[PDB]
Structures are given as structure tokens and as C-alpha cells.
Design a binder for this molecule. Sequence first.
Ligand SMILES: CCCC(=O)SCCNC(=O)CCNC(=O)[C@@H](O)C(C)(C)COP(=O)(O)OP(=O)(O)OC[C@H]1O[C@@H](n2cnc3c(N)ncnc32)[C@H](O)[C@@H]1OP(=O)(O)O
Ligand SMILES: Nc1ncnc2c1ncn2[C@@H]1O[C@H](COP(=O)(O)O)[C@@H](O)[C@H]1O
Length: 533
Amino acid sequence: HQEVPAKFNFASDVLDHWADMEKAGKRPPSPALWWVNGKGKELMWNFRELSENSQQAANVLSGACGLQRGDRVAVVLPRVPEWWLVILGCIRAGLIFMPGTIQMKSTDILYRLQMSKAKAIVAGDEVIQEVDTVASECPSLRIKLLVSEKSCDGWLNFKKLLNEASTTHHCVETGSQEASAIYFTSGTSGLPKMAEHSYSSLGLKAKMDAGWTGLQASDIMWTISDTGWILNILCSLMEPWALGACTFVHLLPKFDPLVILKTLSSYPIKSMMGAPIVYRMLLQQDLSSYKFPHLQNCVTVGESLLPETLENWRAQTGLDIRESYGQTETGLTCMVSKTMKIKPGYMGTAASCYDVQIIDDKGNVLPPGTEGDIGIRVKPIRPIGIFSGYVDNPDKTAANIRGDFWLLGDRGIKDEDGYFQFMGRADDIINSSGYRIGPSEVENALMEHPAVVETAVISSPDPVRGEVVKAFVVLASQFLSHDPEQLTKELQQHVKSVTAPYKYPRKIEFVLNLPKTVTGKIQRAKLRDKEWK
Ligand SMILES: CCCC(=O)SCCNC(=O)CCNC(=O)[C@@H](O)C(C)(C)COP(=O)(O)OP(=O)(O)OC[C@H]1O[C@@H](n2cnc3c(N)ncnc32)[C@H](O)[C@@H]1OP(=O)(O)O
Ligand SMILES: Nc1ncnc2c1ncn2[C@@H]1O[C@H](COP(=O)(O)O)[C@@H](O)[C@H]1O
């Protein structure tokens, strides 16, 4: 059960509120999207322009391309304004948007198009070849829209059609619970599932969290993220636009901490969001060379924020980092808001929609100080912000419900004030530098190589990245004579070539056998335990 309005749409109910206010002269034209490429190109839309231009977006998707309410549109773009325009476009036209990363390889993309039966893909120069390799294998795929300075046979020209489109679109009266986005999400075993979010679970939820960061209507916030991750829709797009604030985007084509540091010291960025690894890379630089007195709010999600990282950032910049915690399925689940005291090593308290608790094997709420499983009350009322379920897979959804609670799959402890401390993933999912990696994905990749007869992929402790993907590999005997170091690199290269490179095995150990259950299932937990300390 849920307690929402019957209808909601971020675009008509939030974005267009800010456009009208400018139109009505009740607010001056206020910056919404400020994009830079680092090479001297900058573009800015105020809220009217953002509105007008994304209505153009919607008319491209629904008029030119004929996409219809409920159709699914894959979106694989780098950090260019058109991602924001397209996403808004989908929201207006009632299209289900499915972001992914430009790190994807052809098989990654095939898997998503076939699984989702997408009717459209909106891509850039990065993956176009990749897509063309597999498009003929996707019978539901009708529309291929390319965001590029070049045109290409078989691709519609987004930037041209956009410019040709009307600035008036009639926004669809989308329902609160109606599908708006699918985000593919990795699991403890098997390949990625389709996590479906509603118009409310993203848009209403973000409206209600808006401000936790410390952002005000007149500030600029820079979220540093691949456009594919849910971080992007919630913090780069919805958080600021809920408040009428401006969102900053740097193409940041190579993730360069020095460019980050120069950007912070050259623009009036008030808030920044990024995974802890971003703050760690930044700390490896010489921050004395930079000053950014305008920056006041630094937040993080995706990984545990190390007390030492928190400490050093404070020492080196005079600023706190306020942590938050969540997953694709739940969004922002816990946070340290601007006014809360920071407890090093704790990720904050429940998002305001959520009853978050530590729960036992039978689903009972545990007392403070007791380790258990972290859970969001979803019965009898399902809170605004929880996703709608795994598409086509209600069993897997049912499988993460225990009693009245949805299970995050993380262990934790709750203190006396309701602050949560993360105590580890309870399953085989790997978290490496803020990525959520399914072990089967990396295993299948390795198994394609003739050298690998059997493999198990588990997490390995790493100072810098927290945790890295490690493979245990049983070798085809022919290969026992190869140089190990050479063979390791060959295998690493192989994984990187067939699936998004971020998941490759940074460590590989060759072994004669993998431990198993009497039923013949590999005991990753066993390997994982031995690998830690
Ligand atoms: C409510 C929940 C919200 C959320 O938290 S959503 C989750 C948020 N998570 C994140 O944002 C993840 C953030 N972390 C990162 O982005 C980091 O990985 C970070 C900061 C960019 C550092 O990245 P890098 O080490 O440069 O690269 P990477 O860690 O992504 O690993 C990729 C490996 O492969 C390479 N690669 C990348 N693109 C490639 C390409 N197109 N072709 C061939 N190779 C490529 C890359 O060099 C790296 O390999 P290597 O370490 O150099 O051997
Ligand atoms: N603040 C944090 N501390 C520790 N782990 C986190 C934090 N935020 C996110 N995670 C991990 O990342 C997962 C979410 O991955 P994703 O679904 O890609 O957002 C969670 O289930 C946690 O395992």
C-alpha cells in the first residue's frame, strides 16, 4: 500500500513550476544547467530554457521517433547536456528511461536491449559501433538516436531534430506509481536485473529529500558521476531542480582529480556530491595549490566513508563530508543532513520517508547496538522512494522481502540516536570503488577464455578502492606452462574487452580447486573469509 497523489511528474510538477515563475516574472531567470567541457566551451540554460528545450526533447521522442507511452528507451551518453534533455524528454512523453554507462561493450548492450525489449536507444560516438554490432539481433528496437557532431547511416540526428522541434509539448498525465525508469542492477548471482522506479519513487522522493545536502535555491551543486548510475538522476538532476538551484556538469572526459580541483577553484560551486573514491583521489593531490572558499557542502554515497578520509578532508579543506547510504532499489536510504552532527564511521539516519531498522533472521526489529540486516519497512505502507520491483521477476523481488521489511543485503548496527554503521555486504556482491559488481558477470567473462576451466570471483580488501574484484581461476592444463604474470594480464585484458572494464579482476590467483557444497555449489563466502585477514 502507498500514500501519494494519484498522479505525479517531475517535469510538470517541479521543473515547469520553476519555468512558469520566470515566465510570470515572479523570479528572475535563474540558472538550472551549467555545462562546461574544460576546453573553453560552456553552456547554460535557465529554467524556462530547460523547459522549452526538454519539450523539444519530448516532441523528438514522441513526434519524430513516434515513441509511445510505456515504451522503453536505452540511454547511453557521456556527460553532455543532451542526457539531461533526453531524460526530461522521456519523463514528459511518459517513456521509461534506462540509463547505462558508455563503458559498456556490445554484449552488455545486447543483454539490456533484448531483456528490456527497448524500442529506442539514444547513444553517442562512444558506443555507436558497439550498438550497430548487435542491433539486428534486437527485434523490438526501432529507433536509434545519435547525439554527435557527425551524422551516421542508420542513426537519427538528435541535435538536428531537437532544433527542429516545437518548444511546446503536452506533458503526459503520468501516474504516481507508473513506470518511469529502469536501472539494471547487479545481483549476488546471475546477470543484472531490471530495477523499476516510478514517477513518484524518483521524483516525489527527491522532492522530499531535497535540501538534505544544505543546498539553497540560489546555489550551484556539482554531482560527479557517470550518467548511467542512479546517483545521477537523484543528485545531479532532481535534487537541485526540486529547489530551483543550478546543477553543474563537467564533461570530465578523463576522470582527472587535477581538473576537478581546478574546476572547484574557478567556479562558484557551493555543493559537491561524489563517491568516497573521488574524495580520496582529490586528497592524493596537493590541495594547498588550490582554494575554493565558495564550497561549503561536500556529500558522498556509494562506499563507506573512512574516518581517516573524513578527517583528512577536514584538515586539508576545513570542510566536513556528510555521508549518505542507499542502493538502486531504495535510493537515498540514510543520510547525514546539513544540521546533523557527524559521527565518523556512521552513514546517518533514515531518509524522511523511510522507517529504517536493523532486523533479525525472522524479521524482528533489533535493539540498538545489535548487528543485523538493514531493512526498510514496506508493510503495511510502502514508502515513497522504494522501487516498483524487478521487471518480469516478482519472485526475486519477493525474495528480498522479510516480514514487513525490504532487505538491502547489507549488515549494520544502529546506535542510540538512530545513526547507522555499515558492517558489510551480507552476500556475494562486490563493491569496488563505488561500483556494484555481480560475480557471475565477471565469471562468465573469464569462462569464455580457453585458459579458464573453473573460476570464482570475490571481493578483496584494498587500501585505496576499499575492495577489489579478485578471481580464483583453475587453469586448463595446457596453460600451466605459460608465464603467470603474462597469463594474468591476458585474462584481465580479456575481461576488459568483453564487458564494462570497471568490473575486471585486479587480482587473479590460480588454484587447483574451488570449495563447494555437497550439492556442488561454490562457497564464495569461504574464499572471501580466507581472503580477508
Ligand atoms: C543511491 C545510491 C547512489 C549511488 O551511489 S550509485 C553508485 C555510485 N558509484 C560511482 O559513482 C562509482 C564511482 N567511482 C568511480 O567512478 C571510480 O571508478 C573513478 C573515481 C572514476 C576512478 O575510475 P578509474 O580507476 O579511472 O576507472 P574505473 O575505476 O571506472 O575502472 C575501469 C578500468 O578499465 C579502464 N577503462 C575505462 N574505460 C575504458 C574503455 N572505454 N576501454 C578500455 N578500458 C577502459 C580503466 O583504466 C580502468 O582500468 P585500470 O585500473 O587503469 O587497469
Ligand atoms: N555510505 C555507504 N557505506 C557503505 N556501503 C554503501 C554506502 N552507500 C552505498 N553502499 C553500498 O552500495 C550498495 C548500493 O549499490 P547501487 O545499487 O549501485 O547504488 C549498497 O547495498 C551498499 O552495499
